[model samples]
Target: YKQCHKKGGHCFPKEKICLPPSSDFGKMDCRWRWKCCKKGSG
Candidate 1:
């Protein structure tokens, strides 16, 4: 499974999921063009 930080995006077909914003960081919006978990799940 995969998770997206942003509200909208395309997840892998077999791996589709949207995780809530990380409290460690804070809310996410296009303003920062923020991309958490943007890459492979590390």
Candidate 2:
């Protein structure tokens, strides 16, 4: 149950190819692919 998810933006593994404003391009939940961002260290 730890595939990936971002309270604001942070995920990966779907085809690998996402990088928004510090991590802010969310959508497609689960499997991973949200990439949202908010000072998530990087």
- Candidate 1's C-alpha runs over 4 A off are 1-31, 38-42
Model 2 stretches with alpha carbons more than 4 Å out: 1-3, 6-21, 30-38
Per-residue error (Å), model 2, residue 41: 3.2
lDDT of 1 at 4: 37
lDDT of 1 by residue, 1-42 (tens): 133344334323322343443322222332343332333333
lDDT against the true structure, each candidate:
0.33, 0.42
TM-scores for every candidate against the unseen true structure: 0.15, 0.20
Estimate, for each residue in 1-42, the C-alpha lDDT of model 2 and write its tens digit.
Answer: 132342454554445554433544444354444343334364
lDDT of 2 at 33: 44
